[PDB]
Design a protein around this ligand. Sequence first.
Ligand SMILES: Cc1cc2nc3c(=O)[nH]c(=O)nc-3n(C[C@H](O)[C@H](O)[C@H](O)COP(=O)(O)OP(=O)(O)OC[C@H]3O[C@@H](n4cnc5c(N)ncnc54)[C@H](O)[C@@H]3O)c2cc1C
Ligand SMILES: Cc1cc2nc3c(=O)[nH]c(=O)nc-3n(C[C@H](O)[C@H](O)[C@H](O)COP(=O)(O)OP(=O)(O)OC[C@H]3O[C@@H](n4cnc5c(N)ncnc54)[C@H](O)[C@@H]3O)c2cc1C
Ligand SMILES: Nc1ncnc2c1ncn2[C@@H]1O[C@H](COP(=O)(O)OP(=O)(O)OC[C@H]2O[C@H](O)[C@H](O)[C@@H]2O)[C@@H](O)[C@H]1O
Ligand SMILES: Nc1ncnc2c1ncn2[C@@H]1O[C@H](COP(=O)(O)OP(=O)(O)OC[C@H]2O[C@H](O)[C@H](O)[C@@H]2O)[C@@H](O)[C@H]1O
Lengths: 401, 401
Amino acid sequence: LKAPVVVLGAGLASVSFVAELRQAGYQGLITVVGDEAERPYDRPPLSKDFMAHGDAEKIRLDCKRAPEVEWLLGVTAQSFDPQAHTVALSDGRTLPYGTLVLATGAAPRALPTLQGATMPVHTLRTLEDARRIQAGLRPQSRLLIVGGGVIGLELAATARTAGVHVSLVETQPRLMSRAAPATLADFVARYHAAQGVDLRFERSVTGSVDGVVLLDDGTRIAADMVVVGIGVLANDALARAAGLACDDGIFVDAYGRTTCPDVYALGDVTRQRNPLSGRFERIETWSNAQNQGIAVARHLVDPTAPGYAELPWYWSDQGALRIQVAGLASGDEEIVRGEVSLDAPKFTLIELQKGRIVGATCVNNARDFAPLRRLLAVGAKPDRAALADPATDLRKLAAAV
Amino acid sequence: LKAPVVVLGAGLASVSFVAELRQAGYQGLITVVGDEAERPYDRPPLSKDFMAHGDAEKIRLDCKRAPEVEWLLGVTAQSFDPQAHTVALSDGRTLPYGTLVLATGAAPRALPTLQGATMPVHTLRTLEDARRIQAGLRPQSRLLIVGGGVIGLELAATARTAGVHVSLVETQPRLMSRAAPATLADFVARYHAAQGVDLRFERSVTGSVDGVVLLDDGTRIAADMVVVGIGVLANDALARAAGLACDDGIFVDAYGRTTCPDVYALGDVTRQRNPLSGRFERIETWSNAQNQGIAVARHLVDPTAPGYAELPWYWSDQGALRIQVAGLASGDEEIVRGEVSLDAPKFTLIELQKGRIVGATCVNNARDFAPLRRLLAVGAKPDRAALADPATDLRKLAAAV
Ligand SMILES: Cc1cc2nc3c(=O)[nH]c(=O)nc-3n(C[C@H](O)[C@H](O)[C@H](O)COP(=O)(O)OP(=O)(O)OC[C@H]3O[C@@H](n4cnc5c(N)ncnc54)[C@H](O)[C@@H]3O)c2cc1C
Ligand SMILES: Cc1cc2nc3c(=O)[nH]c(=O)nc-3n(C[C@H](O)[C@H](O)[C@H](O)COP(=O)(O)OP(=O)(O)OC[C@H]3O[C@@H](n4cnc5c(N)ncnc54)[C@H](O)[C@@H]3O)c2cc1C
Ligand SMILES: Nc1ncnc2c1ncn2[C@@H]1O[C@H](COP(=O)(O)OP(=O)(O)OC[C@H]2O[C@H](O)[C@H](O)[C@@H]2O)[C@@H](O)[C@H]1O
Ligand SMILES: Nc1ncnc2c1ncn2[C@@H]1O[C@H](COP(=O)(O)OP(=O)(O)OC[C@H]2O[C@H](O)[C@H](O)[C@@H]2O)[C@@H](O)[C@H]1O
């Protein structure tokens, strides 16, 4: 930790990091560069309640635990020189740094086959994006969503609630293949289909002509608007240019260190060790941005502190489904607590590997999620008969560990 | 570049690195720690002429361009403390360092299904390994090789030349799936089959009982000796323990930097950017160990020097086949120069992507390999009709670029 500190990006990872720097006792300069001209804000509401109520003043991040920070909003960091220890800004200024933190997030992947489209085609990452999409959610209009991942499905539910007709094209044979157990994804598809979403599995978009999207089975889907949610790409261009190790994401260790001295990285832009798989992955979650920002700041101020150690988890709100997912999507065994039913959906899934909990899912069952995250953290090996048995309560199981 | 320099590992990457340090003009201390009690030696001969003639004094590396280096042979580095800047040795000594270089290579993967075997099962990486295997190559004995990669096939050819019966089990539908064009691998299989090797594709070993190996199709193969060549795993344990970013290999940038200040890594142990794919990969070649060692040393002595930039290539000697392979195994087009024939095999393959050369193969055609590596390096886009046409000579094509 050398002053001054400069952070590039003003999203959750950045705000969480700089708040922790202050709270841990660092009193030197902190400057944050954010390319969006927006008071820092949280993204999860964008495909959820914001989409419904439209009040951006309900989604702002709390920067009050980060006193004495200069936020340069609406400014783009164009490059940095890690020898000179400087950052070049789009407004023509240069910032010096002792420690540089890259917290620049990720951007939606574009669909190459719609690049020449003559119909609206949007992606959803920013407040500007959400406002643009929401304005097009005219009741009785037709929306096509490309991609059956979390953003696509949250938008699908939002659009159906709004009275919009929804079709959805997914290249895989299932939804949410990235980070969800098969049992969850099968149920989720039954849910969306029951709510009127026209799901097209094992299909791809091949092009579009005069307001109509073309598919690889030689068929057509007419739509008024297309939203593409086919994943993200790390915003790692400054790091690539400056000579850091990166591959769709900046490689970092548990201290947040890049391969370049005095340069760190946090949040969606990083590729990092998942302790449960033991492999490097991009972890594209809200809880990672917050918790990794906090851990890296803490260790910078106090090098005796441990490196980042938290295990991954996320949630998704898709209409009537409040989905929570921790750890790995599969092991060698799955245990199902409750009935999997479209009538008052409520269940929990537990993934085991040789008797040890490696992942858990809760659908409309928030009470079970915290105990299971604690069992997961210690790699508990509970009685499998007990885990299934509905009589068992999980909180007491966790507390006994 | 802070003195003293300590390198862990005494293989090609280490010798190449320390020779370049001296030649570039660094005059400070250099100490090399090597766990093998052997004068530093090259590995490619081990499955080639050494296997045939057995003289280790023909395979030693030249350490004379590395004057004033203390080589601690037969010593294992057990850990390093990157805060204290020290390395703990198996003989109870500690070394201080200004710059630490991890050049510890990779180890053969074991076969889990033969772990309890009661018959000889060997892998081939070291001089000790090669000596042990060679002693078992009794004429008219039966060898089973597990793995249809380069080491397995070079051993297969060696063993057939020695009068040994060879069977070979490969899980994939083809040989050399890791880094060879399909056209090459199809030919190579025809060659080995013609030389008497019993090839078993899309099979795995499930176990062994009383001298007989069991397969996943429910069948059996009797053998006197098993050699396992199913790939390697990076020797990255010290880096993992010390908190560096690693995932079956230490992540490094083009300067050789790890995520830990003052610690670098080189050779088989690294995961690095392949400039042709733009992805991070372990590059497990002789030319990488040498050229990456040289580039990293050069840039340490002279920070104005460019980072490592060479494109990948290797060769394999399999009986009558002198195979050379550069760049990517495939693109969107392959061009075949010459006839692919078991009678006096001699041909070249050229892989293109949108007209640009991205890879090349020469079989018994060394004269063409250097010109093609030069065309590849600049991403030439030669006349495809000309590349095919036998009248064209490639050296002049390269020189014109
Ligand atoms: C619609 C949507 C729904 C989501 N729902 C959930 C959810 O329910 N649960 C969950 O766990 N996760 C959810 N997420 C993911 C979560 O929001 C992200 O993991 C989190 O935003 C990552 O934070 P970050 O700080 O790393 O990156 P970001 O939030 O992307 O912030 C990075 C900022 O840096 C800026 N930047 C980039 N380059 C430069 C530059 N050169 N100069 C200046 N600034 C730059 C970017 O424009 C951006 O403003 C959702 C995301 C979206 C978009
Ligand atoms: C049989 C065989 C055939 C090959 N044929 C070819 C070929 O024809 N063409 C080609 O391009 N490539 C070939 N290769 C690959 C090539 O030899 C390697 O790419 C090269 O050896 C990598 O060099 P290196 O210095 O990175 O690692 P290594 O040669 O593995 O050297 C690393 C050294 O560090 C030692 N070490 C590990 N941990 C410690 C520790 N804690 N303390 C001290 N020492 C440690 C290791 O034991 C080893 O001696 C072949 C390899 C083998 C084994
Ligand atoms: N060309 C394509 N056509 C159709 N579907 C595609 C295509 N390419 C990928 N897909 C599918 O799109 C889906 C993308 O899912 P996610 O990776 O969850 O991506 P997205 O929903 O865009 O969200 C990106 C990120 O932001 C949120 O934090 C979200 O949790 C995710 O981490 C996957 O099911 C994938 O199979
Ligand atoms: N369980 C298995 N059973 C049978 N075959 C397997 C199995 N697992 C992997 N294989 C096959 O084994 C082969 C291993 O090939 P390489 O990766 O070339 O590994 P190996 O020949 O052991 O050599 C390791 C390294 O040393 C040399 O430098 C060589 O070039 C290579 O880089 C591949 O064709 C792969 O499909």
